[PDB]
Amino acid sequence: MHIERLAVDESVGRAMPPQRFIEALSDLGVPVEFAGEDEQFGPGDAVASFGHRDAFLDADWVHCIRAGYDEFPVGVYEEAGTYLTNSTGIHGTTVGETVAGYMLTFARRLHAYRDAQHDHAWDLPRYEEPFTLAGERVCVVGLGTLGRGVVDRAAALGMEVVGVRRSGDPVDNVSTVYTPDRLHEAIADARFVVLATPLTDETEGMVAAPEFETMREDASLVNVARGPVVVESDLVAALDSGDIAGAALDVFSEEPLPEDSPLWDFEDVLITPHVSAATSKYHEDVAALIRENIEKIATGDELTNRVV
Amino acid sequence: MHIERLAVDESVGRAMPPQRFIEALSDLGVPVEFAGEDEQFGPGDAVASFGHRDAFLDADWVHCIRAGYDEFPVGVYEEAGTYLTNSTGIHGTTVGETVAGYMLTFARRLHAYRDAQHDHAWDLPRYEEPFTLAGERVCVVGLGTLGRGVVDRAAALGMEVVGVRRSGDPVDNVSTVYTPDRLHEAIADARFVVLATPLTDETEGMVAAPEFETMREDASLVNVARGPVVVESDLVAALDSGDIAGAALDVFSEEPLPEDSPLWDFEDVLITPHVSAATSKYHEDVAALIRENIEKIATGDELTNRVV
Ligand SMILES: NC(=O)c1ccc[n+]([C@@H]2O[C@H](COP(=O)([O-])OP(=O)(O)OC[C@H]3O[C@@H](n4cnc5c(N)ncnc54)[C@H](O)[C@@H]3O)[C@@H](O)[C@H]2O)c1
Ligand SMILES: NC(=O)c1ccc[n+]([C@@H]2O[C@H](COP(=O)([O-])OP(=O)(O)OC[C@H]3O[C@@H](n4cnc5c(N)ncnc54)[C@H](O)[C@@H]3O)[C@@H](O)[C@H]2O)c1
Ligand SMILES: [Cl-]
Ligand SMILES: [Cl-]
Ligand SMILES: [Mg+2]
Ligand SMILES: [Mg+2]
Ligand SMILES: [Mg+2]
Ligand SMILES: [Mg+2]
Ligand SMILES: [Mg+2]
Ligand SMILES: [Mg+2]
Ligand SMILES: [Mg+2]
Ligand SMILES: [Mg+2]
Ligand SMILES: [Mg+2]
Ligand SMILES: [Mg+2]
Ligand code: NA
Ligand code: NA
Ligand code: NA
Ligand code: NA
Ligand code: NA
Ligand code: NA
């Protein structure tokens, strides 16, 4: 096909300033322009956006600036003949680092020390509290971009790494790969269980009371996927009961996390506001995907990360 | 003529429960006995201690359970004929992990999110705040056990690593090493400056107003060495002025850090209570060194980590 301009929907501001992205693409080979929420599109238009608007169905191509596309109506794009791509592939370093940071925070007790800092308290941990990630086990559920970003960093810190993916096939830096059939075996002996799957009707509610029972009482859950992969109320009950020790949570069933959620108040819960992938260079990272697909369009090659 | 007993001074409790350590020393071939602060010593005694007591100068050998021995009067041990060893070599994984945790905390803004957690605030970072360690520069000052623990993990996370040591000679995972006379060159372009030297006459007050001026305004100091390597009042002044952005501090010129230190109150300072090396297995890690040196002394070999 033939792209005549890239419209940058104002919604991209949920992850990056639109002007930074626009200017980053000054040499793309088609003009790039800010688009407000009430604009119309037509033949030749590509649109980069955070979320979906029905107006985009008059464009030739929509690039979702997120990895997760579970809030796009994929069926309506098919019918309109509008291509849809996502941003999978670009979040491995940011998420991987964040998750390494969560794990090190728990091992080295940094969050407890931060709490004490507010009170000007020189508070020493219990002797049994501080440990090293070296030699501890992590299970990574989902072994795509996010999961591999986590795996690589965990392995380099000397962790024992296992994980779960649909094929069960070997993955670089993972000692043992399990199919989803064997989730309970995969999580049972892990100090950390990390969720890195898309939200689909197959992964929704995957981690609930029975999984928390299976998990070690000294283990922590990490959710950087989507909130509804966990049954949130079961997680609260598990934390209350001591079925698991704690959790690092970047995503929730309702975001922003409501103020009356019990999750805020657990010492060994870390709440982060859907920012495990945040980066001051997100504009460059998304721009690279746009450049790639503009080359594919020019040459008549299949688009990267095409959803429909 | 042999070591006939190992006394465990009560001061070891500053780091680990004494009876955990005593029980870890059950293999040794000499009895292991708790010693209170009024114990007398004599020929054939070895003593494991946190700090110095003049009573130890009647013993044959003191093992300091810390890496840093700056609080010991090394001069008087020589005249008394008492050997003195330290615990250098066992803190690379713990401190390396803690420092990686500090740097990831700053990059990923985890400390800011923890502050917000207390307020149930879903506070989003400014676009420029979150970054990745990958591609950022760290300068590690001191390239022994602690500094190489730091370096190896920084390198594995994709950082650019430079550093300083007395000889200025190469070190694995350090792309450029500088002599101490080139400290300002080493630190000038670093996003993180990590201190990992002993406290000596040479290093006391190494990092002061001129060093904070040279450092990038966006840089963070990490001190896991000893407080007095920094001129603490100059660090406060630099943070007030914005000469640097912040700091992760495990050690202080007075410990416990007084409740009225200005350092508690900076958002981008992390205070930790001299616990970057804390570990639930410290008793095992130190016992290994004791076993090693009991065997060295028994056989007439040079002692490991002999100071005097
Ligand atoms: N928190 C954040 O800011 C953030 C950032 C990016 C992505 N995400 C979320 O993470 C998801 C994954 O992103 P990605 O870029 O790694 O995608 P990806 O397509 O590269 O990887 C997905 C992986 O999940 C696996 N998977 C699917 N169903 C599974 C199941 N039932 N059990 C186990 N594994 C299963 C796949 O087989 C693959 O290994 C996104 O869909 C999005 O929801 C969150
Ligand atoms: N925070 C903690 O809990 C904790 C734990 C262990 C050690 N420490 C401190 O860290 C210090 C270092 O321990 P280590 O085991 O790494 O010691 P080490 O002897 O293995 O290494 C010391 C390093 O510092 C370097 N150094 C000395 N003078 C220097 C100078 N003027 N400029 C630059 N580099 C210089 C040496 O060349 C060497 O590379 C200890 O003496 C102790 O004070 C703190
Ligand atoms: Cl797969
Ligand atoms: Cl040296
Ligand atoms: Mg508006
Ligand atoms: Mg506690
Ligand atoms: Mg189940
Ligand atoms: Mg608990
Ligand atoms: Mg609360
Ligand atoms: Mg702020
Ligand atoms: Mg100077
Ligand atoms: Mg500033
Ligand atoms: Mg205060
Ligand atoms: Mg020998
Ligand atoms: Na991917
Ligand atoms: Na460990
Ligand atoms: Na459990
Ligand atoms: Na050493
Ligand atoms: Na970076
Ligand atoms: Na400066």
Q: Which residues pair with B163 in a beta bridge?
A: B140, B177
Per-residue HEC secondary structure of B271-308 comes to: ECCCCCCCCCCHHHHHHHHHHHHHHHHHHCCCCCCECC
> Which ligand neighbours the alpha carbon of A112 most closely?
6
Question: Which long-range CB contacts under 8 A does A118-123 form with residues at least 24 apart?
Answer: A118/B115, A118/B118, A120/B259, A120/B260, A120/B264, A121/B259, A122/B256, A122/B257, A122/B273, A123/B273
Would you say B106 and A280 are in contact if contact means Cβ atoms under 8 Å apart? no
Active site annotation includes A255: yes
Of B30, B60, B72, B88, nearest in space to B285 by CA: B88
Sign (positive or negative) of CA dihedral A152, A155, A159, A161: positive
Strand order in the sheet with A176-178: A176-178, A160-164, A137-141, A192-195, A220-223, A246-249, A269-271
Catalytic residue from among B137, B165, B191, B226 = B226
CA distance A275 to A253: 15
Question: What is the DSSP code (8-state) at residue B176?
Answer: E
Rg (CA), chain A: 21
Question: Which long-range CB contacts under 8 A does B63-72 form with residues at least 24 apart?
Answer: B63/B87, B63/B289, B63/B290, B63/B293, B65/B12, B65/B15, B65/B16, B65/B286, B66/B15, B67/B91, B67/B145, B67/B146, B67/B198, B67/B277, B68/B198, B68/B199, B68/B225, B68/B226, B69/B307, B70/B198, B70/B199, B70/B200, B70/B226, B72/B307
CA distance B271 to B256: 11
Strands A160-164 and A176-178: parallel
* CA A35 distance to own-chain centroid: 26
CA distance A73 to A70: 8
Would you say B86 and B304 are in contact if contact means Cβ atoms under 8 Å apart? no
Per-residue HEC secondary structure of B234-250 comes to: HHHHHHHHCCCCEEEEC
Question: What is the DSSP code (8-state) at residue B254?
Answer: S
CA distance B124 to B132: 17
Give how far Cα B76 sits from Cα of A121, A290, B45, B204, B279, Å.
37, 71, 17, 21, 32
Nearest-CA residue for ligand 1 atom 39 is: A143
CA distance A252 to A254: 5
CA distance B152 to A67: 31
What's phi and psi for B193, nearest 5 deg?
A: -120, 120
**Look-up of token digits 């997100």:** A282
* CA B228 distance to own-chain centroid: 12
Contact state of A109 with B134 under an 8 Å Cβ cutoff: no
Contact state of B157 with A158 under an 8 Å Cβ cutoff: no
Interchain CB contact of A267 with B (< 8 Å): no
For residue B200, give how far its alpha carbon lies from the nearest alpha carbon of chain A (Å): 26
Type of residue found at B232: E
Type of residue found at B182: R
Active site annotation includes B255: yes
Length in residues, chain A? 308
CA distance B159 to B149: 14
Q: Is the CB of B168 under 6 A from ligand 2?
A: no
Type of residue found at A29: G
CA distance B32 to B13: 15
Q: Which uninterrupted H or E stretch holds B129?
A: none
Strands A32-35 and A5-9: parallel
Could you tell me which residues come within 8 angstroms of residue A99 by beta carbon, excluding any fewer than 6 positions away?
Answer: A149, A150, A153, A154, A194, A222, A224, A248, A276
Nearest-CA residue for ligand 2 atom 10 is: B225
The two three-digit tokens of residue B44, written as one number: 């054939």
Q: What's this structure's resolution in Å?
A: 1.2
Interchain CB contact of A281 with B (< 8 Å): yes
The two three-digit tokens of residue A242, written as one number: 């001591």
CA distance B7 to A172: 49
CA distance A18 to A10: 6
Of A270, A271, A147, nearest in space to A197 by CA: A147
User: Hey, what domains does chain B have and what are their CATH numbers?
Assistant: 3-91+278-308 (no CATH), 92-277 (3.40.50.720)
Could you tell me which residues come within 8 angstroms of residue B193 by beta carbon, excluding any fewer than 6 positions away?
Answer: B138, B139, B141, B187, B207, B215, B219, B220, B221, B222
What's phi and psi for B118, nearest 5 deg?
A: -60, -30
Half-sphere exposure of A114 (CA within 13 A, CB side): 28
The two three-digit tokens of residue A81, written as one number: 């003949």
Q: Which residues pair with B269 in a beta bridge?
A: B247
Max Cα-Cα span within chain A: 66
Of A87, A58, A85, nearest in space to A308 by CA: A85
Could you tell me which residues come within 8 angstroms of residue B110 by beta carbon, excluding any fewer than 6 positions away?
Answer: A98, A101, A102, A105, A110, A111, A270, A272, B104
Max Cα-Cα span within chain B: 69
**Look-up of token digits 């238009």:** A45
CA distance A154 to A161: 7
Of A285, A264, A270, A274, nearest in space to A14 by CA: A274
**3-class SS of residue B40:** coil
Contact state of A131 with B280 under an 8 Å Cβ cutoff: yes
Give how far Cα B158 sits from Cα of A96, A97, B100, B108, B135, Å.
12, 11, 12, 15, 6
Would you say A215 and A187 are in contact if contact means Cβ atoms under 8 Å apart? yes
Could you tell me which residues come within 8 angstroms of residue B300 by beta carbon, excluding any fewer than 6 positions away?
Answer: none
Testing the interface with B: which of A272, A274, A285, A286 to mutate, by most B Cβ within 10 A?
A272
Question: What is the DSSP code (8-state) at residue A131?
Answer: -
Interchain CB contact of B48 with A (< 8 Å): no
What's phi and psi for A140, nearest 5 deg?
A: -105, 115
Interchain CB contact of B158 with A (< 8 Å): yes
Q: Which uninterrupted H or E stretch holds A221?
A: strand A220-223
CA distance B117 to A263: 10
Would you say A71 and A50 are in contact if contact means Cβ atoms under 8 Å apart? no
**Look-up of token digits 């800010």:** A34
Sign (positive or negative) of CA dihedral A156, A185, A266, B131: positive
Would you say A157 and A131 are in contact if contact means Cβ atoms under 8 Å apart? no
Identify the burial level of B302 via C-beta atoms within 10 angstroms of its C-beta, where 0-12 means exposed, 13-18 middle and 19 or more buried.
exposed
Would you say B100 and B153 are in contact if contact means Cβ atoms under 8 Å apart? yes
The two three-digit tokens of residue B130, written as one number: 């979150």
Contact state of B16 with A127 under an 8 Å Cβ cutoff: yes
**3-class SS of residue A273:** coil
CA distance B140 to B169: 14
For residue A78, give how far its alpha carbon lies from the nearest alpha carbon of chain B (Å): 34
Q: Tell me whether residue B275 is annotated as binding.
A: yes
Q: Note the helical H segments in chain B.
A: 18-24, 74-80, 92-108, 110-118, 145-156, 183-187, 209-214, 232-241, 282-299
A264: chain B residues, CB-CB within 8 Å: 117, 120
Q: Is A2 left (phi over 0), alpha (psi -120 to 50) or beta?
A: beta
Would you say B215 and B244 are in contact if contact means Cβ atoms under 8 Å apart? yes
Of B235, B101, B41, nearest in space to A105 by CA: B101
- The minimal CB distance from B94 to the residues A129, A132, A158 is found for A132
Would you say B4 and B45 are in contact if contact means Cβ atoms under 8 Å apart? yes
CA distance B86 to A202: 57
| Ligand 1: lining residues by beta carbon, under 6 Å | A 67-68, 88, 91, 95, 141-147, 164-166, 180, 196-199, 202-203, 224-226, 250-251, 274, 276-277
Sign (positive or negative) of CA dihedral A10, A12, A16, A22: negative
Sign (positive or negative) of CA dihedral B265, B226, B157, A132: negative
Would you say B107 and B268 are in contact if contact means Cβ atoms under 8 Å apart? no
Give how far Cα B74 sits from Cα of B82, B85, B86, B305, Å.
10, 10, 12, 13
CA distance A301 to A296: 5
Of A150, A189, A143, nearest in space to A168 by CA: A143
Would you say B85 and B304 are in contact if contact means Cβ atoms under 8 Å apart? yes
Atom of ligand 2 nearest to the CA of B250: 1
B279: chain A residues, CB-CB within 8 Å: 130-132
Would you say A104 and A97 are in contact if contact means Cβ atoms under 8 Å apart? no
CA distance B205 to B229: 5
